[PDB]
Each structure stands twice: as C-alpha cells, then as structure tokens.
Design an enzyme around this catalytic site. Structure first.
Site, PDB file in Angstrom:
ATOM      1  N   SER A  92       0.808  -1.217   0.000  1.00 48.48           N
ATOM      2  CA  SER A  92       0.000   0.000   0.000  1.00 48.48           C
ATOM      3  C   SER A  92       0.851   1.283   0.000  1.00 48.48           C
ATOM      4  CB  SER A  92      -0.950  -0.005   1.182  1.00 48.48           C
ATOM      5  OG  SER A  92      -1.856  -1.083   1.066  1.00 48.48           O
ATOM      6  N   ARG A 118       3.202  -6.401  11.302  1.00 51.82           N
ATOM      7  CA  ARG A 118       2.530  -5.160  11.718  1.00 51.82           C
ATOM      8  C   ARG A 118       3.352  -3.998  11.219  1.00 51.82           C
ATOM      9  NH1 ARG A 118       3.955  -7.269  17.143  1.00 51.82           N
ATOM     10  NH2 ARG A 118       5.861  -6.238  17.900  1.00 51.82           N
ATOM     11  N   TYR A 119       3.614  -4.000   9.914  1.00 49.88           N
ATOM     12  CA  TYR A 119       4.360  -2.907   9.291  1.00 49.88           C
ATOM     13  C   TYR A 119       3.792  -1.528   9.575  1.00 49.88           C
ATOM     14  CZ  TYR A 119       8.136  -4.974   6.440  1.00 49.88           C
ATOM     15  OH  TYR A 119       9.289  -5.595   6.040  1.00 49.88           O
ATOM     16  N   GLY A 120       2.466  -1.427   9.521  1.00 51.26           N
ATOM     17  CA  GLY A 120       1.771  -0.168   9.750  1.00 51.26           C
ATOM     18  C   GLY A 120       1.828   0.822   8.596  1.00 51.26           C
ATOM     19  N   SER A 187     -14.203  -3.472   8.965  1.00 56.29           N
ATOM     20  CA  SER A 187     -15.583  -3.514   9.540  1.00 56.29           C
ATOM     21  C   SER A 187     -16.459  -2.230   9.410  1.00 56.29           C
ATOM     22  CB  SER A 187     -15.489  -3.910  11.029  1.00 56.29           C
ATOM     23  OG  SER A 187     -16.754  -3.906  11.676  1.00 56.29           O
ATOM     24  N   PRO A 188     -17.512  -2.250   8.535  1.00 54.09           N
ATOM     25  CA  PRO A 188     -18.515  -1.161   8.532  1.00 54.09           C
ATOM     26  C   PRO A 188     -19.334  -1.011   9.835  1.00 54.09           C
ATOM     27  CG  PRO A 188     -18.588  -2.343   6.445  1.00 54.09           C
ATOM     28  CD  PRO A 188     -17.687  -3.126   7.352  1.00 54.09           C
ATOM     29  N   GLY A 299      -2.490 -17.815   1.663  1.00 51.73           N
ATOM     30  CA  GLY A 299      -1.957 -19.158   1.772  1.00 51.73           C
ATOM     31  C   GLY A 299      -1.827 -20.005   0.519  1.00 51.73           C
ATOM     32  N   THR A 321       3.417 -14.790   1.109  1.00 50.41           N
ATOM     33  CA  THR A 321       4.086 -15.590   2.141  1.00 50.41           C
ATOM     34  C   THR A 321       4.806 -16.826   1.615  1.00 50.41           C
ATOM     35  OG1 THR A 321       2.629 -14.676   3.794  1.00 50.41           O
ATOM     36  CG2 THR A 321       3.842 -16.654   4.404  1.00 50.41           C
TER      37      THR A 321
HETATM   38  C1  LIG Z   1       4.896  -8.445   5.256  1.00 53.35           C
HETATM   39  C2  LIG Z   1       3.525  -8.240   4.675  1.00 53.35           C
HETATM   40  C3  LIG Z   1       3.131  -6.958   4.268  1.00 53.35           C
HETATM   41  C4  LIG Z   1       1.868  -6.726   3.709  1.00 53.35           C
HETATM   42  N1  LIG Z   1       1.482  -5.485   3.322  1.00 53.35           N
HETATM   43  C5  LIG Z   1       0.280  -5.253   2.715  1.00 53.35           C
HETATM   44  C6  LIG Z   1      -0.157  -3.919   2.252  1.00 53.35           C
HETATM   45  O1  LIG Z   1       0.614  -2.946   2.385  1.00 53.35           O
HETATM   46  N2  LIG Z   1      -1.378  -3.783   1.701  1.00 53.35           N
HETATM   47  C7  LIG Z   1      -2.223  -4.826   1.529  1.00 53.35           C
HETATM   48  O2  LIG Z   1      -3.351  -4.695   1.013  1.00 53.35           O
HETATM   49  N3  LIG Z   1      -1.897  -6.076   1.906  1.00 53.35           N
HETATM   50  C8  LIG Z   1      -0.705  -6.348   2.504  1.00 53.35           C
HETATM   51  N4  LIG Z   1      -0.348  -7.648   2.908  1.00 53.35           N
HETATM   52  C9  LIG Z   1      -1.338  -8.719   2.698  1.00 53.35           C
HETATM   53  C10 LIG Z   1      -1.008  -9.513   1.457  1.00 53.35           C
HETATM   54  O3  LIG Z   1      -1.232  -8.660   0.329  1.00 53.35           O
HETATM   55  C11 LIG Z   1      -1.921 -10.736   1.365  1.00 53.35           C
HETATM   56  O4  LIG Z   1      -3.283 -10.291   1.306  1.00 53.35           O
HETATM   57  C12 LIG Z   1      -1.822 -11.697   2.563  1.00 53.35           C
HETATM   58  O5  LIG Z   1      -0.483 -11.805   3.054  1.00 53.35           O
HETATM   59  C13 LIG Z   1      -2.320 -13.085   2.231  1.00 53.35           C
HETATM   60  O6  LIG Z   1      -1.555 -13.756   1.228  1.00 53.35           O
HETATM   61  P1  LIG Z   1      -0.340 -14.762   1.568  1.00 53.35           P
HETATM   62  O7  LIG Z   1      -0.868 -15.748   2.583  1.00 53.35           O
HETATM   63  O8  LIG Z   1      -0.005 -15.357   0.250  1.00 53.35           O
HETATM   64  O9  LIG Z   1       0.787 -13.877   2.086  1.00 53.35           O
HETATM   65  C14 LIG Z   1       0.930  -7.881   3.496  1.00 53.35           C
HETATM   66  C15 LIG Z   1       1.371  -9.141   3.891  1.00 53.35           C
HETATM   67  C16 LIG Z   1       2.599  -9.387   4.473  1.00 53.35           C
HETATM   68  C17 LIG Z   1       2.918 -10.809   4.857  1.00 53.35           C
HETATM   69  O1  LIG Z   2       1.488  -2.408   6.336  1.00 56.62           O
HETATM   70  C1  LIG Z   2       0.897  -3.283   6.985  1.00 56.62           C
HETATM   71  O2  LIG Z   2       1.061  -3.405   8.229  1.00 56.62           O
HETATM   72  C2  LIG Z   2      -0.114  -4.200   6.393  1.00 56.62           C
HETATM   73  C3  LIG Z   2      -1.119  -3.718   5.569  1.00 56.62           C
HETATM   74  C4  LIG Z   2      -2.110  -4.601   5.106  1.00 56.62           C
HETATM   75  O3  LIG Z   2      -3.042  -4.216   4.348  1.00 56.62           O
HETATM   76  N1  LIG Z   2      -2.032  -5.891   5.491  1.00 56.62           N
HETATM   77  C5  LIG Z   2      -1.053  -6.328   6.315  1.00 56.62           C
HETATM   78  O4  LIG Z   2      -1.009  -7.520   6.660  1.00 56.62           O
HETATM   79  N2  LIG Z   2      -0.105  -5.487   6.768  1.00 56.62           N
END
Ligand SMILES: Cc1cc2nc3c(=O)[nH]c(=O)nc-3n(C[C@H](O)[C@H](O)[C@H](O)COP(=O)(O)O)c2cc1C
Ligand SMILES: O=C(O)c1cc(=O)[nH]c(=O)[nH]1
Ligand SMILES: CCn1c(CO)nn(-c2nc(O[C@@H](C)C(F)(F)F)c(C(=O)Nc3c(C)ccnc3Cl)cc2F)c1=O
Length: 359
Positions: A92, A118-120, A187-188, A299, A321
């Site tokens: 994002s 929890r990048y934030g 959540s709405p 996953g 992942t």
């Molecule tokens: C380290 C990390 C950072 C992520 N950052 C974002 C993000 O910035 N925006 C977002 O929509 N999803 C983010 N995700 C969620 C992934 O886009 C994805 O929806 C989620 O990890 C499930 O897929 P996976 O099990 O293949 O990782 C992040 C996931 C991880 C593990």
């Molecule tokens: O930047 C993050 O913390 C982040 C954003 C997001 O949409 N999903 C996630 O797992 N982490």
C-alpha cells in the site's frame, strides 16, 4: 527436471539457511533489492494459453500475481514480471511518506508456514511512487499490452481525519499509472459510510481521461462478520465496483499455531490463512452472484491451493508468504501444478474453472 531441481534446493536448503541468518525485515529489504536488480533465474516456465485470463478490462498472461506488501514502494516491478508473475500489485502507498510501526514488526512462524506482520503502512508516499512509475511508464504500457498488468494498492496516513480524501488523492496521483487500484476495507451508519467512501473513489476514477482510467477493487480482511460481508456485497453491486480482493491477513489466531511468536500483534498470513480465505471467496462469489471478479489470496503455495480458490470463485490469485519460504521458484511451481490440475479435472483453461464449485 531442472525446475523441480531449483524448487527443492531453495525450499529445503537455501531459504531455511538465509532466513536463519537474517532478521525478517532485512530479508524483505534484500529481496526487494535483488528483485529490482533482476538477480533471478531466466524464464524457465513459458506460459501456456490455458493460463490466460481476460478480466478487469485486461489480458492476464497467467493468473498468479504478487500480493500487495512485498513491493510497497514500486521498486521491483520489472523483476517481479521476470520472476513469472502474471501481474504485479504494488503498495500500500499512502499520500504522505510515513515510517510505519517501530521495529521489530515482522515475525516468521516456520513451523506453521506463516508470517505475522505489523508494518503499519510504511510508505515512500504518493509523490515518490508516482515519479518512480513515471520513469518506466512506457515500458509498463508494453507489459500491460503483452498481458502483464500493474495494480496499485492505495492506503491512508495514520493521522488522517478523512480516509476518503486520502484514497481520492491516491486515485488522482497513481490511477493514471495503474491498470487497477485497490482500497482496503475494514468492519462497517456503517454501510452508508462505506457507500460514501466508495462513491468518492469511483467519482475520482471516472474523472480521469479514458485511456488512463483504472479498474477499482475493494480488498477485504477475512475477519468480517456475515452482516459486514452482506453489506459489502450489496454496496459493490450497487456502485459498480470492478472487483474484490479476498483476503488480507487475519487478526485471528487459529487453534494449532506452533510458532513461538504466534502471540505477536499483527496480521497472520500463509498456510493458516488458506482455508479462511477460500471460504471468504466462496461467500463473496455467492453474495455477488458470480458477477464481480475476485482476486483470491491467502496461503497459496501450490497449484492445488490456486485451483481451490479459482473453483471457489477467484478469476486470479495472488501470493506472498509462500515466496518467503520457497523463494522465486514457487511461481513456476504454482503455475505448472495449476496447468496439470486443470488438465486432470477436464478444464480447457483457467476461465472454465472459475466458480466451478458453485455449478
Ligand atoms: C509483510 C507483509 C506486508 C503486507 N502489506 C500489505 C499492504 O501494504 N497492503 C495490503 O493490502 N496487503 C498487505 N499484505 C497482505 C497480502 O497482500 C496478502 O493479502 C496476505 O499476506 C495473504 O496472502 P499470503 O498468505 O499469500 O501472504 C501484506 C502481507 C505481508 C505478509
Ligand atoms: O502495512 C501493513 O502493516 C499491512 C497492511 C495490510 O493491508 N495488510 C497487512 O497484513 N499489513
Ligand atoms: C515477509 C517478509 N519477508 C521475509 C521474512 O518473513 N522473507 N521475504 C523474502 N525473502 C527473500 O529472500 C531473502 C531471504 C533474501 F535475503 F535472499 F533476499 C525472497 C526472495 O525471493 N529472495 C531471492 C531473490 C529475490 C532472488 C534470488 N534468490 C532469492 Cl532467495 C522473497 C521474500 F518474500 C520477505 O519478503
């Protein structure tokens, strides 16, 4: 094969060794850097016609994308296509630069094939990303024409009073550079607030010149109530939202996690998320009557995992992942296994399998 050779070496030896030498965020940063430099095996898996999907106003050469989070700031897009992804989602991206949460903020659960983060919303910000994409804009135009589209996931700044305006700013700045945009929903007056938000995003999108007009998708978590899902489906259909990304990480901790770090705050991804994600796809496909394209994510590490989401209703899939555990050969693996399974189950291609469980 030489392909199954690399797959084994990375999964059994190289990735475990590297992850044992590096903290998780350092592994992430180095991965982005190596990807950005193209330090990757040459094109091993040549994409079959069976894998082609037409959706969201675009050709996708294959249905396996890189999920948001890996390339937050649009630094590694070209390397991600070289890795064999059929499409790339960056972000994002937030309007202003922000640092995100304090470190440590990424945690490996190898016993569970999972991560907690929890990048934030650490982000270089819209301006930096806009200039980075502008530098390669015509290269991307040819990639998209060749069936390799680009998505941009838009975030909001931590301290923002007006979420809708942050997303609107993102549409205006990066929408002209994107094939699709994504806005994450939680959540709405909740349904009405979602309608208001998405109306503003769509209005801004519709204000862009026709040639530079991206599809808009909503990305949901797996932790929503039935009522939340029912309300999202309703609003998406009412407003003509182009698609759904199903799902983000989970704030739940499924029974059975073994990793020492299972109680760290954050979103859980990888294998423990898989079936929660698939069943959310199944529900959203049914609530939208199969009319709203779904990108399935959570996953995916095998062809079986990909096909399960496709049959549940996904047109496309993403992973992240699995790459942290298997490395770059996982992309070729997922694609090869998916093709083989499609043939085994009597599908002419991916398109025929989309939502097959519902029939
Ligand atoms: C380290 C990390 C950072 C992520 N950052 C974002 C993000 O910035 N925006 C977002 O929509 N999803 C983010 N995700 C969620 C992934 O886009 C994805 O929806 C989620 O990890 C499930 O897929 P996976 O099990 O293949 O990782 C992040 C996931 C991880 C593990
Ligand atoms: O930047 C993050 O913390 C982040 C954003 C997001 O949409 N999903 C996630 O797992 N982490
Ligand atoms: C969730 C954060 N997180 C973690 C930890 O939870 N790991 N991780 C990844 N780490 C990777 O490799 C590192 C070990 C390193 F240091 F080698 F860069 C890669 C990767 O593809 N590396 C890579 C490349 C690009 C080219 C050739 N060879 C190889 Cl091994 C992919 C990842 F998603 C990542 O994003």
């Amino acid at each position: 094969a030489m392909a199954t050779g690399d797959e084994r070496f990375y999964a059994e030896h190289l990735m475990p060794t590297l992850q044992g030498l590096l903290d998780p965020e350092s592994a992430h940063r180095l991965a982005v850097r190596f990807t950005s430099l193209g330090l990757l095996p040459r094109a091993r898996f040549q994409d079959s016609d069976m894998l082609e999907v037409r959706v969201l106003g675009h050709k996708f050469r294959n249905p396996v994308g890189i999920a948001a989070g890996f390339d937050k700031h649009g630094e590694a897009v070209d390397g991600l296509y070289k890795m064999g992804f059929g499409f790339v989602e960056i972000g994002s991206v937030t309007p202003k630069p922000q640092e995100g949460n304090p470190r440590p903020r990424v945690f490996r659960l190898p016993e569970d094939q999972a991560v907690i983060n929890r990048y934030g919303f650490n982000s270089h910000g819209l301006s930096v990303v806009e200039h980075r994409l502008r530098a390669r804009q015509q290269k991307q135009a040819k990639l998209t024409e060749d069936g390799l589209p680009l998505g941009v996931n838009l975030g909001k700044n931590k301290t923002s009073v007006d979420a809708a305006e942050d997303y609107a700013e993102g549409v205006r700045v990066l929408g002209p550079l994107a094939d699709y945009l994504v806005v994450n929903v939680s959540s709405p007056q909740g349904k009405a607030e979602l309608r208001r938000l998405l109306t503003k995003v769509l209005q801004e999108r519709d204000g862009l010149r026709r040639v530079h007009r991206p599809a808009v998708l909503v990305k949901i978590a797996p932790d929503l109530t039935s009522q939340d899902k029912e309300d999202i489906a309703s609003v998406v259909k009412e407003l003509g939202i182009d698609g759904l990304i199903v799902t983000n990480t989970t704030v739940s901790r499924p029974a059975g996690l073994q990793g020492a770090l299972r109680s760290e705050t954050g979103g859980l991804s990888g294998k423990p998320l898989r079936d929660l994600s698939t069943q959310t796809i199944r529900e959203m496909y049914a609530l939208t009557q199969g009319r709203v394209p779904i990108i399935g994510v959570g996953g995916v590490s095998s062809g079986q995992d990909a096909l399960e989401k496709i049959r549940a209703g996904a047109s496309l899939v993403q992973l992240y992942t699995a790459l942290t555990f298997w490395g770059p050969p996982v992309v070729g693996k997922v694609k090869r296994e998916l093709e083989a399974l499609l043939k085994e189950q009597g599908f002419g291609g991916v398109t025929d399998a989309i939502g097959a469980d519902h029939r």
